[PDB]
Every structure is written in structure tokens, then in C-alpha cells.
Amino acid sequence: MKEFYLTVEQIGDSIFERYIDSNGRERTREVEYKPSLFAHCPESQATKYFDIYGKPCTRKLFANMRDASQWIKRMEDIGLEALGMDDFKLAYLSDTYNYEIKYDHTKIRVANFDIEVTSPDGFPEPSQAKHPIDAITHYDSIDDRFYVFDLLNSPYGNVEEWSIEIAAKLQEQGGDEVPSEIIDKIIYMPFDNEKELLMEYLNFWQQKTPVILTGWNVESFAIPYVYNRIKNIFGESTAKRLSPHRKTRVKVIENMYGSREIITLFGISVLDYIDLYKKFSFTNQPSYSLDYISEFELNVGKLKYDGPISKLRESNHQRYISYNIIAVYRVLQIDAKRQFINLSLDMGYYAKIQIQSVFSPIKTWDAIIFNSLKEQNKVIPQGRSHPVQPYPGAFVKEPIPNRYKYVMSFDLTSGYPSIIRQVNISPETIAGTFKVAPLHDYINAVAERPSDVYSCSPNGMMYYKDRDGVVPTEITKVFNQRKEHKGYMLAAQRNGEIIKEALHNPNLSVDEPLDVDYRFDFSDEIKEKIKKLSAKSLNEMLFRAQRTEVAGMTAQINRKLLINSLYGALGNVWFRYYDLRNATAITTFGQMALQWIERKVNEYLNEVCGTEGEAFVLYGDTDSIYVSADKIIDKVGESKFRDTNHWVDFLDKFARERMEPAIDRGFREMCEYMNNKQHLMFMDREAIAGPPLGSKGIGGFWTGKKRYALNVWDMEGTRYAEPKLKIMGLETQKSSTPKAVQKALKECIRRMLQEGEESLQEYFKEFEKEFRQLNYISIASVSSANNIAKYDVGGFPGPKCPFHIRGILTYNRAIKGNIDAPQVVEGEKVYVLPLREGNPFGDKCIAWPSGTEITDLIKDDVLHWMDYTVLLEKTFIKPLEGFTSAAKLDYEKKASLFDMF
DNA sequence: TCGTATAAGCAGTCCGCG
DNA sequence: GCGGACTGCTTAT
Ligand SMILES: [Ca+2]
Ligand SMILES: [Ca+2]
Ligand SMILES: [Ca+2]
Ligand SMILES: [Ca+2]
Ligand SMILES: [Ca+2]
Ligand SMILES: [Ca+2]
């Protein structure tokens, strides 16, 4: 096989590399790598090395990495650019793996672990590590085994061995329901004392040294706790055995409001799954407890027990250990679905970076661009200091608040990356400037043509047309990968709808799910077999189709994230190729394209309807337009349609055969006007929306910018079995809105869009009457809690104290003295409830940690003093009033003359 | 919240508005 | 009461 790296580190003048050799075996080596850097030189000096602007360079080979580093400093002292890859391990990888890396994940050791620590005096601080580690479960991907290290004897209690037989049994048998599929993969090891547990763990770690290390909060809790505990008991040198090169570093993480410390383990790549999830999941969750995320992702029940966790080990050690094991498995189950480890490995090896660097698009793109240029013997520029400066972004059209019956939407495929490619926007392709006219003169095609030589953006920038820049070239490669995976995702989505249709008529029989690839549209043969299948087999196929769709979504949306973050990196001062001329060239061109094509679509539709000056485009944001189709539907007559799906086909056909060709012609003219390198503005139809045929549903509505709702029948070629609500920005989409309120507001919207005013009125009346029975957690608001200390004046609200912070301070007073009650953590999220006048907490609200029940001693009082009237008005009635006034209807029936009878 | 970008919505505080 | 200046938080893109 071809060799590939696992990890790489610089330690002084040595590179330390773990790698898989040509026989598929893990190896480690120390290499005294001699890096090269570059300086500009005279023309007469013959070289093969040139900077990105074509200026000749001489290569300087250093005796060691420390010499290169000192050379860079002295070059700053002189005032001259020091060119080349200053991160030497990236140069090492580039030299050592000078080909497209083909990696074999089965050879990479991925470890997933979790520890338990009993603590009677509140949260066990990792930096202190003053309590015994009483359980470790460590899963190894190569052995496919869960290794369990169990402490039987502790100052906080002596206990019996955990029983795998009881673990396996059902909850209803008194067991722990550890999944049967992992029961045989558990290797259980009990210990008399913590010292021998820990020494054994280190010996094990030496044998099975993680390459990728993950888990839930491992970077912030598990790793620092284990490191600092071993340090306290045995000393530093022993603690550093967690690094295969015996080197670690205490690493301070800073933000605007304080800082914390992590432990960097040299020769390990730590990918904490909580951070993978936050970056790549495209969710914003009320809570990030493993319990909460597992429930959301997997539909598994909460891991239930009696009493506080601080007494779980001594009261029920059996369950204590079983829940440690299940916690580890939960993360593997989330990854099986979401596939973020797979994503990270793909991106990391593509870029030739340390795998943990996938969190930084700046590092990722610096490595991609360096490797690309190095192939052509070109030399990268030195990074420079820049002050942070604002710059302008996208155009967003102000909609007229209203109901909108029939809507068709279009938007650009990979908008900003396509602009980069079309205009040829790159550091080394800047050709000059031209004198800019007001943006509207370009939009209306009345400004002078910018250039007859170079490719232009309306911000005044001109670019070379004779060859692609390195940014367009590399962004295209990742864009093409994105396109492939989006295709797989959309096929899986279409296949899912075929299964849902067939579930209307499930056959009474015993049979199996078909063995099919859900990434490709089902053949006619597969479709015929599906119509004969039972509900059980269809349901299992639907689940598999939906897992394939999720796998496709992860691959495509995060490749989209990566290329969009290259645009964004151009406006970040730490990026080697930072340049606000290029960032604004992209955003300003985007503004023009949107309003240019708005004009063209309006002109086109006014033409086919024989009107003048009528506005068919009702809204747009960044690179999308929403088109009113009422007049198109009315030109045929609603009476002519057999059913909903009939007019959806008609609009689908109109969009593809009439609108898109008009859109394409409009952008071809704009490309020539700007003299761009290549026409890449491709604005595909997205949504087809309207009410069910013959209903009183309103179809859709807008309240304002970034706030709308549409009843969609077809989305990018997916024809739904049942219409789907596309709701953007409204309170149903906000993590701050209470769960039960999201649900009720969504049903009100469904009724508005599908059934009409009377249906909405019936549902409102009922919700208002019954909502006081809703569980308190379901009706709590949610907020992040920053700067709690800033607003704490003697345990009371200081000036301008935010409502949610006030709630936290109220909580802090109510639990004072207790080292047992849960503390609210700075920067994490809280549930919030209003309180009726004259309550015992002495203020108008209370907040507590999100994803948890409020502690029992104040729970009853909170439940008794909850202000349901305020909660209803603020979270439900206010937003609904906004939706309904925008849609021009009433959520409460108005009086009439018929009331006289 | 260590980790690419800007535009823009709503909740709430503080206080003016005769 | 509303709305402007401001902070805080959370979306759409
Ligand atoms: Ca635990
Ligand atoms: Ca787009
Ligand atoms: Ca699209
Ligand atoms: Ca059937
Ligand atoms: Ca869009
Ligand atoms: Ca009480």
C-alpha cells in the first residue's frame, strides 16, 4: 500500500511522525528535518523559484528548524519579507507525502473514552483533580472493544464488581439494558485501588496509543482530569506518558470574557465530539449534554437514575458503570449517523494538515494553497499584521409584509465560490482598478463598461483573464466534491419519498428490505418490488434511506462550509491571503447579480403577461429570489387543474423551460458587461409553494427580512408525499423559543398555510385554554448566559442587567450555601421562567442550567409561582400576532351581524 | 464561546416624549 | 406606550 501519516509534531529541531508504512503497520520516527525558506533575489540570479507575482526568489536551506525561525525574526528586524511555509511540519508533510493521499481508516486507531469521578463538594475541577477517578470506559476502533476500568475501593465507598449479566437485562428485569450488540465487546477490569487502575491504564495506553482521540467534553474535562490526577499521584513524567513523545503543554484558551486551560498531548489528534458537533451539525441546541443530544439525534431515552450523580456510585455502582459504558457507545452511535470523524479524516488528508486542524478553515486553506503552489515551484508570501476593519456584505430586499399564495424560488448554486471562479478573484490575479459608478448604474446597465481587457467586479477591481488564480483553481476542486455528495444526498431524499408513498399501501406479508444503494435513484425494478413490500420492510428501508441522506448531507454541507469559509478567510486578518479588495469584490458583485437578475425576471414576466412595471420578485437575500406565480396560475385558471400535483407540474415545467432560460440569458449579458473570465451564474429553481388545491390555505407569508413561511410541494426536484413547511427565521426556528411553543406556533402556521383562517382560530382557542398543563421545561425560554459576574452587584442585578442574567442571580440567591446544588456555568445555556408578583424568590424571573430539571428544594416553589400569563403573551401571542397581522387575518374570531342569531 | 464572513431580526433596559 | 440608543442573543445567507 501507499504510506500515510497519522500524526506529526515539531519538537525543537526534530519532526516526530507516527505513520502507516508500506506494509500497513504503524511506525514512529524522529527526523532532523532541514526546512527551506525564501528571499527575493536579483533578475540576473537564475532560479526556478518565483513568488505568486512572478518575482524571482532564492531558496535558503537551514541547518535546522530553529535556524529558520531565527532567520525569520532577523528578517523582520531588517524589514524584508521572509517567504515560504513557516509552519515546518506542513512543509515536512508536503515533502514526505508528495502525492494525493489514499488513507485506510481501518489502520487508524480511533479511541473514544469517558471517565467517572465521584465528588461530594460540587463539580470536580480538572485543574485541581482532587477526587479519585473511579471509572474509565475506553473504546478502541481497531480491537472493536470497550475496555472498562472499575475502581472497587475508594475513600467515597467500597463496592462489588459490576455484573455483565445484570447489565444485559431489561430495565423491567432490574437490569441496565446495555445494548446486546456491544455485550460481547466488553472487557471488564476491576481494581483494588486507584493507583493500580491508573498504572494499568497507562500501560494499556502505551500498547493501544490513540491516533484520533474523541469523546464528549474530553478536551475540557476528561483529558485534563486524567492528566492532572496522574500528575498529583505519580508526578509529571508519568502523566506525560499520555503523549507518545512524552511531551505535553498546558494550553490557555482565551475569549472576550475569561479563559480556561487544556492539555495538548503531542502525537495525539484530539477531536472532541462536542466541538465536531457544534462546527459541522448545523444545529443550535438548547443544551449540549450527551443525554440531550443523544435523544435528539438517535431517539433514545434518558439514562435514568435516583438521587444525585454524587451518590450514584455508592447507591447503585452496577448502574454507575453501565451508564459509563452506554455514554461511550452513544458517541459512536452519533458518529455512525453523522460521520464527522470520516469528514475530518477526508478534509485533513486532502489538505495535508494535522487532523485536529480541520476546525480552522484558515489553516486548512493555507495548507491546500501552499501544496498547490509548491507543485509549480512557486513560493508563498509572508503573513502580515492587519488591523480589523469592517466591510460590506450581501443585499437583502425589504419585502411587503403580506400573504403570498403561489411562490417559486430560485438561487445561485454555490454563490460566492461561483463569483470567485467567474471573476477570477485571487491574490495573484489582481490586474488593477477602474473608476466606479453607483451600484444601481451597473444593475440597470447604464454605467460605462468597466474594461475591455480584464474581468471586473462592480467594487472597482480588475483581474487577469489569461489564467486561473490559485484560489479559483482550488475552490473548484472542493466545489466539485461538494456537487458529487449533494447528488447522493438528493437521490436518497427522492428515494425516501418513494418509500413514503408505498407505505400508504403496505402488503400483508413477511419479507426483507431490498439490498440497495440509496445514493442512486431507484430503478423501475426496485420500485416495483417496493410496491409489494410489508410495512416492516418499508420502514426499515425508509430508515436506511434517511441515514444515507444524512451521510450525504454531512459530506456536502461541510464541503460547502469549507469553500464558503475561503471567501470568509479573505476577510480575516490572520489569513495569509487576507485582502478586503478581494472580499468586497465578491460581496459587491453578489449585490449586483441579485438585483440585476431581479430586474431581468421582472422584465421577462411583465412581457409574458403583457403588463408594465409590475413586481413579480417579492423578495431576495444574498443570491436568491422569490417570484409570485399567482398571475401564471391565473392565466390558465385554477378550474383547469385536476389536483395540487397538476399545478405543481405546470409550475415546475414553466420554471425549467421558460424562466431558467431567461435567467441564463440575463446572466450571460451580465458576464459580458463585466468581461468576466467564465459564465458561472447558475440559478436553479428551489421551491414551488402554494395552498392545497381547493382549500382556504394562504400558501405562504413574509413578516419582514429573513422572516417567512412557505407551504412547499417540490424542493430542488424532490416531490414530497406530503407538503413540507419551509419556515425561515420565525420563532419556530429559534432555540430560544420554548419547545412546546415552537410546536404550537408551527401548527398555527400549518393551519394558516394549508387550511385557512377558521382552522387557525379553532387551534388558538384550544391552545390558550390548555397550555397551563404543559410541563414547565417545555414552556421555559432558553438563552446563553455570558457576563454573569459583570451584572452581579451583591447578588443582585446591576444596571442594564439582562433578563436572563437577572434570572440566574435570582437562582443563585435561592440556592446559597449549597455546594451540592447545580451551579450555572458562565457562557453555557439556561432555561428561563417568569415569576408572579410577590413570589418568595423576590424577583420577576428565575433561570437554571439548560437540559436539566431544577433542583428539588425550589422546584415546587417555581412551579407554584410560574407566571403562565406572561409566558403565554411573550412567547406565543406576540409572535402569532406578528404572523397574522402580516398575513392579514385574525387568530380570534371578530364579531358579526350573525351574532344577533 | 479557540476555530471564515456580513445583514438583520427580536427581547429587554433605560428614558424621553409636554 | 412607543421608539430610539444600546446590549445581548440568535438567526439567514
Ligand atoms: Ca458521567
Ligand atoms: Ca445559493
Ligand atoms: Ca440550488
Ligand atoms: Ca403495496
Ligand atoms: Ca440563498
Ligand atoms: Ca420549597
Residue numbers in the entry: 1 to 901
Quote the study on this structure.
The replicative DNA pol from bacteriophage RB69 (RB69pol) is a member of the B family and is responsible for DNA synthesis of both leading and lagging strands of its genome. It has extensive sequence similarity to human replicative pols α and δ and therefore has been regarded as a good model for B family pols. Our previous reported 1.8 Å resolution structure of wt RB69pol showed that L415 is located right below the triphosphate tail of the incoming dNTP, where a small hydrophobic cavity exists at the tip of the L415 side chain. To provide a structural basis that could account for the different kinetic behavior observed among L415 variants and wt RB69pol, we determined the crystal structures of three ternary complexes: dTTP/dA-with the L415A mutant; dATP/dT-with the L415G mutant and dATP/dT-with the L415M mutant with resolutions ranging from 1.80 to 2.04 Å and Rfree values ranging from 21.3% to 21.9%.
Replacing L415 with either Ala or Gly greatly enlarges the size of this cavity. Similar differences were observed between structures of the L415G ternary complex and the wt RB69pol ternary complex. In particular, the change of the metal ion A position in both the L415A and L415G ternary complexes are mediated by an alteration in peptide backbone. The only discrepancy is that the backbones of T622 and S624 in the L415G ternary complex did not shift away from the position observed in wt RB69pol, instead the carboxyl group of D623 titled toward the cavity generated by the L415 to Gly substitution. For example, the L415G mutant has the largest cavity; thus, the corresponding side chains of L412 and D623 show the greatest tilt toward the cavity. In addition, a water molecule is observed in this hydrophobic cavity when L415 is replaced with Ala or Gly. In accord with these studies, this trapped water molecule is hydrogen bonded to both the carbonyl oxygen of T622 and G590. Therefore, the 0.5 Å downshifting of the metal ion A from its optimal position observed in the wt RB69pol structure would cause misalignment between the 3′-OH and Pα, possibly reducing the rate of phosphodiester bond formation. This could explain why the kpol values for incorporating a correct dNMP by L415A and L415G mutants are 5- to 25-fold lower than the kpol for wt RB69pol. Therefore, the FRET values for both P/Ts in the presence of the L415G mutant are not distinguishable so it appears that the L415G mutant cannot distinguish the control P/T from the Mis-P/T. Interestingly, the L415A mutant follows the same pattern.
